[PDB]
């Protein structure tokens, strides 16, 4: 824990730094160091559990991924996600969509080592308003919006879970299955064109994410800043 | 060793005063050094003053010896 | 735009730095 | 100034600071230029600064504070005893002001006059300690008691304020009336009122004579009077009532500051103008009465203030038991007990003041302080167990040396009653503390928590209480110096 | 004065010392701490060319991303954490509506195989917290709220409501005046007339509340500090 000791003394030192800086500002007669503004670092660590997003993987600036969360290329984290990796890590592969209004959560500390990880293996769509708490979703997966995947669930290999539906603990959805309702019960089978459509939607959102990020890197529009400082 | 006991005392008292009000232990990590300094100087001066007052008390007792010597 | 424009605070700051310098000198004369 | 007034520099400075603060407060409290600022906080911080300056002057100047030997002996004499007593008093006043800063703003009552009296009564008590004449003593006591009369009835829109203040006023004025008649009779039968003259006229030769029946009435009345001002457990009327009614800073200052002063004055008189058994017997009774009353009343109370009142009565009792005999070891342990009690009570009032608003008047509101604020609960348990008794703390060590001295001084009777009231107190308190993880009916999660200065003062004293026994040499030494130079 | 100039220089010096101490602390740390950045978040943005067209009298909480071609009319509000993402197809919301905080609107299938799907929200529509709207046409004065979700070419109509868990799916023509619920959606009541007046009054007073929140949330630093000091001194 020598690392944690270094971290703690780093906090002490930097805190003294902030305090002496503020003394300097009060001396200089400038109280600008009170302009309350939300920190909201889109990527955040706890001690050494920093996230790791691959380059060329769009993460919306309004997202919130903190804790041990790792995500690979061609991925998209669309506005309004909560990717938590505090206790057990989150791993997310290539070519994946975690749409706006979604959290990939990890159960708050249960007594034993019952805190399962969460794996989201590439070519997976996870639509809007999706809560995935401790699950194993695999390649060619569709999680259609309004979705709840409680701890202990395994969906795999071109499998779809419809909409507005929750899957209880310890449930498995293998190839060619759709489940729905409260609780999630099996409805029917899939179609090969629907599976190719899964893949095409994955690719289309990869391109959408490229566009959105290239637009989000557009130099911050100083004009509005000087406007808001004017009045 | 006196100054070390004083410094540890000051640091402990400062952590205490930071723990009573529920804010974390090392809230102002630049007060703790002032606490250590004050504790050190306090304990050192306390030892000095105890030595001095023992000397004065022994002188007073020696003078009280004469007040009872004439008594016999 | 290279000065502090609050008279009372500046008097107080003069007093504070005078205080610290005086304490340092006093200690130096321990 | 003129090299004589070098003997009263602390009093001159504290009076001048009181005046300048009074004028400042009144003008800038009624000046329309600013909004209409109520200057309680600013006047208070300037008052704390002035008190610390007084402490500095007095402490660093004592060996020349004794400079006006006879010209001042007309009224007062300053020795090592008065030196250390005055230091402890100024420390206590600084402590209580710092503790009571946050109460002013919270309770929201605006009268800077509250902090121009604390200083004025402080100067009064500084006169009372170094007081070497019956009438100078009485005048200092009256100045102090008038300051407290003003201080009691602060908030008028409240209910208990006026009744508590009126009770305290009538009680104090009656006590002082009795004391006056006592000094009057001593004057009439003796023909002197300066402690040297009283000593020289009625030492050793207390043998009964024709008109010797007068002196005794005077000293008896003086005993009753000074007793009323030590809460005098046969005469303890309304003491818990006024403790409950008056606000917390006022009752704290009333508990800590006047008691040490009047104890020093009682010691200065009982060394000089006593009888073979008069004063010792009029105190030997009140001591056992006090211990018994503290026990059998604090055992059953349902208001966290009256419990403090009866525990204060009990500890004043233990101190008075220490008073019983008149040997050097005894008075040494006496002064040690006084000091430990001062610390413990500023501590307890710090706590009960940091637990004030949401708990206007309750004792059941120990709503899981073990759970909602554990360090504070541990501190309260430490302070209380010290107040009563337990393996090494400050209060236990003080009581133990008290009973050591009592046994070794020739009184085999105060110990049984003292130890049994101690053990009933210990059973009760250690039942209360272990009642803090059974269950919790009420819960009062508090906006209160101890801004900075109450916390610092608490932390300091609480670290002192437990850590006293690892090195209690200097206290014994300075107490020995003091008691030895009280008369010899 | 010259004293002011001197202490200004001294303050600048010690401020530089503070910055140096802070860098030293981060370097004693390192690798782990993601030091803070500016906001870098857009309350309004375009995609290819479609800029958003937002009424002047609207409320838009600065934690609501409107992207694409969103046409938002008068007397409406886009509350906190909202996401109006119409980057692919058109979004037009009526005048006098309200998207109560933390909701989402998206569209998918722009001009594929001839059939297209726009998305329109009528006037005085009050969509609530966590409402997901995925390519729908909600006619004016319709109530949807508290976690509902509409999946596809659904069309709600003329005072209908879906309440608290309604997962409505795959081109449902909601009847003109009903209530629906269920997962999936079925109707269970008849939507009394005083309740119709309830939804109207809801739209109205919620526009009022939105105007209050706008007047508050659109302040500058000096004005905010003034408001705060005034509030403290008054509560004193
Ligand atoms: C190496 C040590 C360098 C220390 C440099 C000076 C730090 C001064 C910090 C300061 O302005 O504190 C104000 C604050 C006043 O608090 P406040 O509640 O008025 O708000 C200002 C708080 N900061 C500094 C975070 C902006 O002081 C304190 O809270 C307590 C200070 C204790 C005394 C510290 C100095 C030693 C004497
Ligand atoms: C230095 C003393 C002084 O007056 O400093 C004024 C300056 C400026 O005064 P100020 O009026 O800007 O604010 C000081 C008051 N507090 C700290 C509560 C915000 O204050 C300090 O330097 C205080 C912190 C350092 C103390 C050492
Ligand atoms: Zn979508």
Pocket of ligand 2 (CB under 6 A): A 23, 26; C 9, 12-13, 16
| Alpha-carbon dihedral angle through residues D92, D95, D97, D102, given to the nearest 10 degrees | -150
Mutation to probe ligand 1, out of A19, A23, A33, A35 (largest number of atoms < 8 A from CB): A19
B14, β-bridge pairs: none
For D411, the token pair is 């009184």
CA distance A222 to A226: 6
Which chain A residue has the Cα nearest residue E8? A28
- Residue D434, Cβ neighbours under 10 Å: how many? 10
What is the sign of the dihedral through the CA atoms of E11, E13, E19 and E25? negative
Q: Which atom of ligand 2 is nearest to the CA of C20?
A: 1
| Nearest CA-CA partner of D196 in D124, D131, D114, D133 | D133
E173, β-bridge pairs: E155
Q: Cα A110 to chain center, whole Å?
A: 22
CA distance D385 to D374: 16
The pairing of strands E161-163 and E143-145 is: parallel
Instruction: Report DSSP state, residue E176.
Output: S
Q: Whose CA is nearest to atom 32 of ligand 1?
A: B31
Residue pair D14/D119 in contact by the 8 Å Cβ criterion: yes
At residue A44's C-alpha, the angle toward residues A39 and A45, to 5°, is: 130
Instruction: Report DSSP state, residue D277.
Output: S
CA–centroid distance, residue D54 to ligand 1 (Å): 27
Residue with tokens 């006093």: C26
Residue pair E73/E55 in contact by the 8 Å Cβ criterion: yes
What is chain B written as a DSSP string?
A: -HHHHHHHHHHHHHHHHHHHSSS-TTSSTTTHHHHHHHHHHHHHHHHHHHHHHHHHHHHHHHHHHHHHHTT-
Resolution to 1 decimal place, in Å: 3.9
Q: In whole angstroms, how far apart are CA A157 and each of A145, A161, A162, A173? A: 19, 12, 15, 9
Residue pair D376/D353 in contact by the 8 Å Cβ criterion: no
The pairing of strands E59-60 and E83-93 is: unpaired
- Residue E230, Cβ neighbours under 10 Å: how many? 10
The pairing of strands A147-149 and A159-161 is: unpaired
Element (H, E) at D305: helix D304-322
How many Å is the maximal CA-CA distance in chain C? Answer: 43
Strand E186-187: give its sheet, edge to edge: E59-60, E77-78, E98-99, E126-127, E143-145, E161-163, E180-181, E186-187
CA distance D281 to C17: 61
CA distance E126 to E76: 9
Q: In whole angstroms, how far apart are CA D329 and each of D342, D408, D409, D414, D483? A: 20, 9, 8, 16, 9
Residue pair D351/D373 in contact by the 8 Å Cβ criterion: no
- Which residues of chain C have a CB within 8 Å of the CB of A29? 4-6, 9
Q: Is A52 on the interface with E (CB under 8 A)?
A: no
| Alpha-carbon dihedral angle through residues A8, A11, A17, A21, given to the nearest 10 degrees | -160
CB-based contacts of E20, cutoff 8 Å, min separation 6: A17
CA distance A164 to D231: 75
Strand A159-161: give its sheet, edge to edge: A58-59, A76-77, A96-98, A124-126, A141-143, A159-161, A178-180, A185-188
The total number of residues written for chain A in this structure: 231
CA distance D390 to D432: 14
- Residue E171, Cβ neighbours under 10 Å: how many? 10
Which chain E residue has the Cα nearest residue A43? E34
CA distance D252 to D254: 5
E120, β-bridge pairs: E92, E137
The pairing of strands E180-181 and E186-187 is: antiparallel
Residue with tokens 């009990």: D314
Residue pair A132/A115 in contact by the 8 Å Cβ criterion: no
- Which residues of chain B have a CB within 8 Å of the CB of A15? 28-30
Residue pair E45/E28 in contact by the 8 Å Cβ criterion: no
What is D101-169 written as a DSSP string?
A: HHHHHHHT---TTHHHHHHHHHHHHHHHHS--BHHHHHHHHHHHHHHHHHHHS--SSSSHHHHHHHHHH
- Residue D323, Cβ neighbours under 10 Å: how many? 23
| Nearest CA-CA partner of E73 in E49, E97, E89 | E97
For D262, the token pair is 């009047």
CB-based contacts of E190, cutoff 8 Å, min separation 6: E177, E178, E179
Q: In whole angstroms, how far apart are CA E22 and each of A29, A213, C30, D159? A: 21, 31, 35, 55
Peptide bond into D91 cis (omega under 30): no
> Could you give the 3-state DSSP secondary structure of residue E83?
strand
| Nearest CA-CA partner of D172 in D194, D195, D157, D151 | D151
| Nearest CA-CA partner of A211 in E116, E196, D323, E45 | E45
At residue D387's C-alpha, the angle toward residues D382 and D393, to 5°, is: 55
For E211, the token pair is 């105007």
Half-sphere exposure of D168 (CA within 13 A, CB side): 27
Indicate contact of C with B: 3+ CB pairs under 8 A.
no
* A181–E15 C-beta distance less than 8 A: no
For D351, the token pair is 């706590």
Q: In whole angstroms, how far apart are CA E137 and each of B34, E3, E75, E92, E150? A: 68, 69, 20, 10, 10
For E213, the token pair is 């929140």
* D484–B64 C-beta distance less than 8 A: yes
Burial D469-484 (b: 16+ CB within 10 A, else e): eeeeebbbbbbbbbbb
Burial class (CB in 10 A: 0-12, 13-18, 19+), A154: middle
Q: Is the CB of A21 under 6 A from ligand 1?
A: no
CA distance D105 to D89: 25
- Residue B21, Cβ neighbours under 10 Å: how many? 18
CA distance D421 to E203: 73
């Amino acid at each position: 824990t020598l690392g944690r000791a270094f971290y703690a003394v780093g906090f002490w030192i930097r805190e003294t730094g902030q305090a002496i800086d503020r003394l300097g500002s009060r001396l200089q007669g400038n109280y600008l160091f009170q302009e309350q503004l939300s920190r909201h670092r889109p990527l955040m660590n706890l001690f050494d559990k920093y996230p790791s997003v691959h380059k060329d993987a769009f993460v919306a600036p309004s997202a919130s991924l903190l804790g041990d969360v790792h995500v690979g290329p061609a991925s998209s984290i669309w506005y309004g996600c909560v990717l938590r990796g505090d206790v057990n890590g989150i791993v997310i592969g290539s070519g994946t969509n975690i749409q706006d209004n979604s959290l990939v959560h990890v159960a708050k500390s249960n007594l034993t080592g019952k805190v399962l990880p969460t794996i989201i293996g590439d070519n997976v769509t996870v639509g809007h308003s999706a809560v995935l708490q401790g699950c194993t979703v695999e390649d060619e997966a569709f999680i259609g919006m309004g979705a709840t995947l409680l701890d202990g669930v395994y969906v795999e290999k071109h499998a779809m879970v419809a909409a507005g539906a929750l899957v209880r603990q310890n449930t498995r959805i293998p190839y060619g299955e759709v489940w729905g309702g409260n609780p999630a019960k099996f409805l029917r089978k899939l179609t090969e064109d629907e599976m190719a459509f899964f893949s095409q939607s994955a690719l289309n959102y990869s391109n959408l994410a490229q566009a959105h990020a290239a637009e989000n890197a557009k130099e911050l529009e100083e004009t509005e800043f000087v406007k808001v400082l004017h009045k | 060793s006196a100054t070390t006991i004083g410094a540890l005392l000051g640091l402990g008292t400062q952590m205490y005063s930071n723990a009573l009000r529920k804010l974390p232990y090392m809230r102002h990590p630049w007060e703790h050094v002032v606490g250590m300094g004050l504790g050190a100087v306090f304990v050192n001066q306390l030892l000095k003053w105890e030595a001095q007052v023992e000397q004065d008390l022994d002188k007073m007792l020696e003078k009280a010896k004469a007040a009872n010597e004439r008594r016999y | 735009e290279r000065v502090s424009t609050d008279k009372h605070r500046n008097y107080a700051v003069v007093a504070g730095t005078i205080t610290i310098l005086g304490a340092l000198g006093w200690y130096l004369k321990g | 100034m003129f090299n004589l007034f070098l003997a009263v520099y602390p009093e001159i400075f504290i009076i001048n600071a009181t005046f300048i603060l009074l004028i400042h407060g009144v003008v800038f409290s009624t000046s329309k230029k600013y909004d209409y600022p109520p200057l309680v906080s600013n006047v208070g911080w300037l008052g704390l600064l002035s008190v610390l300056i007084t402490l500095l002057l007095l402490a660093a100047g004592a060996p020349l504070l004794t400079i006006a030997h006879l010209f001042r002996n007309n009224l007062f004499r300053r020795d090592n005893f008065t030196y250390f007593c005055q230091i402890l008093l100024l420390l206590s006043t600084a402590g209580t002001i710092s503790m009571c800063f946050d109460f002013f703003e919270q309770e929201r009552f605006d009268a800077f006059e509250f902090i121009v009296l604390i200083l004025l009564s402080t100067c009064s008590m500084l006169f009372m300690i170094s007081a070497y004449d019956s009438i100078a003593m009485y005048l200092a006591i009256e100045l102090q008691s008038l300051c407290f009369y003003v201080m009691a009835a602060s908030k008028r829109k409240s209910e208990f304020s006026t009744e508590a203040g009126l009770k305290y006023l009538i009680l104090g004025a009656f006590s002082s009336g009795i004391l006056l008649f006592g000094c009057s009779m001593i004057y009439g039968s003796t023909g002197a009122t300066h402690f040297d003259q009283l000593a020289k006229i009625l030492t050793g030769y207390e043998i009964t004579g024709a008109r010797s029946s007068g002196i005794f009435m005077g000293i008896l009345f003086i005993a009753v009077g000074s007793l009323f001002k030590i809460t005098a457990v046969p005469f303890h009327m309304w003491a818990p009532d006024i403790y409950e009614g008056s606000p917390t800073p006022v009752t704290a200052f009333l508990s800590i500051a006047p008691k040490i002063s009047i104890f020093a004055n009682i010691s200065r008189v009982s060394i000089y103008g006593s009888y073979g058994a008069t004063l010792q017997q009029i105190f030997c009774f009140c001591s056992i009465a006090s211990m018994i009353l503290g026990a059998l009343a604090a055992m059953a109370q349902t208001k966290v203030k009256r419990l403090l009142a009866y525990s204060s009565i009990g500890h004043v009792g233990y101190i008075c038991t220490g008073f019983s005999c008149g040997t050097i070891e005894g008075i040494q342990s006496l002064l040690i007990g006084i000091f430990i009690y001062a610390l413990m009570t500023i501590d307890a009032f710090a706590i009960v003041l940091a637990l004030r608003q949401t708990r206007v008047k309750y004792i059941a509101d120990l709503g899981a302080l073990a759970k909602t604020n554990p360090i504070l609960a541990i501190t309260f348990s430490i302070t209380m167990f010290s107040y009563v008794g337990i393996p090494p703390l400050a209060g236990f060590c003080s009581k133990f040396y008290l009973f050591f001295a009592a046994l070794g001084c020739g009184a085999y009777f105060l110990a049984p009653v003292g130890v049994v009231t101690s053990v009933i107190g210990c059973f009760y308190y250690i039942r209360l503390a272990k009642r803090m993880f059974f269950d919790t009916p009420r819960t009062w999660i508090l906006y209160e928590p101890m801004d900075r200065d109450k916390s610092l003062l608490l932390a300091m004293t609480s670290s002192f209480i437990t850590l006293f026994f690892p090195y209690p040499s200097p206290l014994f030494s300075v107490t020995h110096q003091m008691a030895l130079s009280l008369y010899l | 004065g010259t004293l002011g100039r001197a202490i200004y220089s001294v303050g600048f010096w010690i401020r530089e010392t503070g910055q140096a101490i802070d860098r030293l602390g981060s370097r004693l740390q390192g690798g782990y701490f993601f030091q803070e950045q500016l906001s870098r978040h857009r309350t309004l943005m375009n995609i290819f060319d479609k800029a958003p067209v937002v009424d002047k009298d609207v409320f838009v909480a600065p934690s609501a991303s409107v992207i694409g071609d969103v046409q938002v009319g008068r007397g409406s509000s886009i509350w906190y954490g909202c996401v109006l993402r119409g980057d692919v197809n058109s979004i037009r919301v009526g005048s006098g509506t309200n998207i109560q905080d933390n909701s989402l609107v998206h569209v998918a299938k722009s001009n594929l195989s001839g059939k297209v799907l726009p998305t329109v929200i009528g006037d005085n529509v009050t969509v609530g917290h966590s409402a997901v709207l995925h390519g729908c046409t909600v006619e004016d004065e319709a109530f949807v709220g508290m976690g509902a979700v509409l999946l596809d070419g659904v069309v709600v109509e003329k005072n209908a409501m879906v309440a608290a868990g309604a997962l409505v799916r795959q081109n449902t023509r909601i009847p003109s005046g009903e209530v629906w619920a269920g997962n999936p959606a079925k109707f269970l009541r008849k939507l009394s007339n005083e309740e119709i007046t309830f939804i109207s009054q809801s739209a109205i007073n919620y526009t009022n509340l939105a105007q209050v929140h706008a007047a508050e949330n659109s302040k500058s630093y000096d004005e905010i500090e003034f408001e705060k000091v005034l509030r403290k001194k008054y509560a004193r």
